[PDB]
């Protein structure tokens, strides 16, 4: 049994465990037979080309299906009266009721609406015709081919880079900062100024005329002579670079000329930043030299050894990358609703809900994975000798202080936050809603006031943003923060207080599980030699009291539940606060979010009505029938996860042995024999499969609920506003 070829341990297994574990360990390239360090980095570099190519093929498919089956040009002519189309439906299982429910009014056939926001992205970038979308689709498929060729080419023996090339940290940082961040942002500022801003002006600039179309009438003469204010001046032609600040009151979105100036300003910062480190020209910083100098008296050896720790551990590098991506992904979610960039996207409420929820769940997975590879680092790559007394080894040295205080904060938050919700629920039940514990969120209102929100009893400490940000942006910023129908610093009250501490509970508890798993990854009192067993192993048996879920992998598994719970609390709160805004029901949110029955009744029960009426014996089907079916599907998958999570292996293995008996004794069927002996799934596999069903069922249920409740009850809104002075 030669599959899997990378593991002769697995390949000689005569059971069905050979197939499952070959799949599960296929991308764990470090643990494969015959792997060297150099061949690992060469395989990764080419694998990363393949992943890049998949991203561009995915984007070209979205572009093709919107161009070929969508209604982009019909939507461009009428952005309020036209629902954007993702792709057509051809499903032979459809009856006549389903075909007409998905066929839009006057339409040719059944289609899916689009909630990815791609139309608003394509329109804001300046695309106006289907030929724009089709040429994007071809270009990304060609770009995908180039990366596939590059990955293949850099596996050829003349082009495989050396291990010293992959470990040249200083050159990679200089190139990724200056070109991959800086020049790419500079190029995007070029697209905005040459293409997207003239398209917003109504001037079609494309490849056929952009060489002979000045983006500014004075073109490039103010740039080189240092007279840069001409690009901001309305009397010297339409401006291309401004700092108005705030949101455009006609659109409710960011100023395009602000977006262009933003990407130009940060391009200069990133290009300058990528001149910091020492490559082959004598000048620049050695990263090892910077880290070794930063050694103070309280933190022992400081950062000495951390260069060779990070540069020789891919799991450390990946954990740092995942954590930073996860923070930035959350920041994308928080700033996309608060400061939207895309024309007609704040008016599409379903898209704003879908995008916030998508990116917060992605950020939650990236955060858990960052700590997972931090735990893998400690078992596989952490050398205590080369990290002697530095800041890394000192974390492990006071790890009982870290875990016990994280345990304290989570219990401190959890006892009182739950206690306050329960207090308010009992008050509402007994007819005493004026005896609720309603705590005013004055520390966060303090933050809003420092940015120029006018809130009566809360002081501007330094004197307000007139003192603290006296820039050119200040009039447009203050006009957008104090305006009605403006998403910047939403009004908050006691319901916002309680859920923010519930969120802080979920953040501290998920961190506690992840940090304890990463810090007890190498060993504990119950298992002092745990690093000799690895990241993922079932247990150490029933001795010493019993040791189920003792591995660092099992702490990942436990924290996924807590991450899903925390992001659930975050996205429930975003959705209910915004559908109360969109639905003109903010007073209901402020009244009912302070106790948990209000969340059950006014959020979950009330907004389930269009969803579960998506198909019915009385009224047939409508467009929500697919979300209604997915909503039930998600409940089924989630509940199926419970079977794997609760009923553990030895039950199933004894059950399978009777089935093995039955097959071998049944006439006409015992002539057919398995090649691999049926066994129950392993202990770790049962946890993983149970977590997978739990997670998939969690996400599909909420996505069906979030989309169908928003698209039926709160689909559209104005998003224009009157600025405040």
């Amino acid at each position: 049994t030669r599959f899997p070829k990378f593991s002769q341990d697995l390949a000689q297994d005569p059971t069905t465990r050979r197939i499952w574990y070959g799949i599960a360990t296929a991308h764990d390239f470090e643990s494969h037979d015959g792997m060297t360090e150099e061949s690992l980095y060469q395989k990764l570099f080419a694998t990363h080309f393949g992943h890049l190519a998949i991203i561009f093929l995915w984007s070209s498919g979205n572009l093709f299906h919107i161009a070929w089956q969508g209604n982009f040009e019909q939507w461009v002519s009428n952005p309020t009266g036209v629902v954007p189309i993702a792709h057509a439906i051809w499903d032979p299982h459809f009856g006549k009721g389903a075909v007409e429910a998905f066929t839009p009014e006057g339409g040719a056939g059944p289609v899916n609406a689009a909630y990815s926001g791609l139309y608003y992205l394509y329109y804001t970038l300046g695309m106006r015709f289907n030929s724009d979308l089709y040429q994007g689709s071809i270009f990304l498929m060609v770009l995908a081919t180039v990366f596939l060729i590059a990955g293949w080419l850099h596996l050829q023996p003349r082009f495989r880079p050396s291990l010293a090339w992959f470990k040249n940290a200083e050159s990679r940082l200089n190139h990724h900062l200056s070109a991959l961040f800086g020049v790419s942002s500079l190029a995007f500022a070029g697209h905005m100024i040459h293409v997207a801003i003239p398209a917003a002006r109504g001037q079609r600039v494309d490849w056929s005329n952009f060489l002979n179309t000045l983006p500014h009438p004075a073109g490039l003469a103010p740039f080189f002579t240092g007279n840069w204010g001409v690009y901001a001046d309305p009397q010297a032609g339409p401006p291309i670079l401004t700092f108005i600040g705030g949101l455009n009151p006609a659109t409710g979105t960011l100023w395009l000329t602000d977006i262009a100036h933003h990407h130009l300003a940060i391009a200069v910062i990133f290009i300058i930043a990528g001149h910091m480190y020492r490559t082959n020209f004598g000048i620049g910083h050695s990263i090892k030299e910077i880290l070794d100098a930063h050694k103070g008296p309280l933190t022992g050896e400081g950062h000495r050894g951390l260069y060779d720790t990070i540069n020789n551990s891919l799991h450390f590098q990946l954990g740092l990358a995942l954590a930073s991506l996860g923070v930035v992904t959350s920041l994308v979610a928080q700033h996309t609703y608060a400061l939207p960039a895309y024309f007609y996207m704040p008016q599409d409420h379903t898209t704003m809900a879908a995008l916030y929820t998508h990116h917060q769940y992605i950020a939650g997975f990236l955060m858990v994975g960052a700590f997972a590879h931090g735990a893998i680092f400690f078992v596989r790559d952490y050398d205590p000798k080369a990290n002697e007394n530095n800041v890394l080894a000192r974390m492990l040295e006071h790890k009982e202080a870290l875990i016990s205080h994280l345990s304290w904060v989570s219990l401190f938050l959890g006892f009182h936050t739950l206690g306050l919700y329960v207090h308010n629920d009992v008050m509402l039940a007994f007819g005493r809603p004026e005896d609720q514990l309603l705590i005013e969120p004055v520390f966060a209102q303090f933050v809003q006031v420092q940015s120029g929100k006018i809130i009566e009893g809360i002081p501007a400490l330094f004197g307000g943003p007139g003192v603290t940000a006296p820039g050119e942006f200040l009039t447009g910023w203050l006009g957008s923060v104090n305006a009605n129908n403006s998403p910047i610093f939403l009004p908050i009250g006691p319901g916002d207080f309680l859920v923010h501490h519930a969120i802080a509970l979920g953040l501290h508890t998920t961190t506690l599980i992840l940090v304890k798993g990463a810090l007890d990854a190498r060993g504990s009192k119950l298992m002092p030699d745990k690093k000799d067993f690895g990241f993922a192993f079932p247990c150490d048996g029933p001795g010493r009291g019993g040791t189920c879920d003792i591995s660092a992998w099992d702490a990942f598994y436990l924290a996924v539940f807590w991450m899903l719970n925390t992001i659930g609390w975050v996205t429930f709160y975003w959705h209910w606060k915004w559908i109360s805004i969109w639905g003109d029901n903010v007073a209901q949110f402020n009244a009912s979010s302070t106790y948990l029955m209000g969340w059950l009744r006014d959020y979950l029960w009330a907004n389930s009505a269009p969803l579960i009426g998506g198909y019915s014996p009385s009224g047939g089907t409508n467009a929500l029938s697919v979300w209604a079916w997915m909503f039930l599907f998600g409940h089924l998958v989630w509940a199926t996860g419970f079977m794997f999570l609760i009923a553990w292996r030895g039950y199933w293995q004894e059950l399978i042995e009777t089935l093995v008996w039955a097959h071998e004794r049944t006439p006409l069927a015992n002539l057919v024999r398995w090649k691999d002996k049926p066994v129950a799934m392993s202990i770790v596999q049962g946890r993983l499969v149970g977590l997978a069903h739990f997670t998939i069922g969690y996400i599909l249920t909420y996505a069906a609920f979030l989309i169908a409740s928003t698209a039926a009850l709160y689909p559209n809104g104005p998003a224009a506003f009157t600025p405040a002075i």
């Binding site: 395989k43 089709y134 498929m141 050829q156």
Partner: peptide, 29 residues
């Protein structure tokens, strides 16, 4: 619109990406 010629062109570009993916996936294995 996306005419029938442009659908056919897109599948030819997709076929070339397919053989490129075939080159990479066998060099990776």
């Amino acid at each position: 619109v996306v005419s029938g010629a442009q659908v056919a062109i897109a599948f030819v570009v997709a076929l070339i990406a397919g053989i490129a993916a075939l080159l990479l996936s066998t060099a990776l294995g």
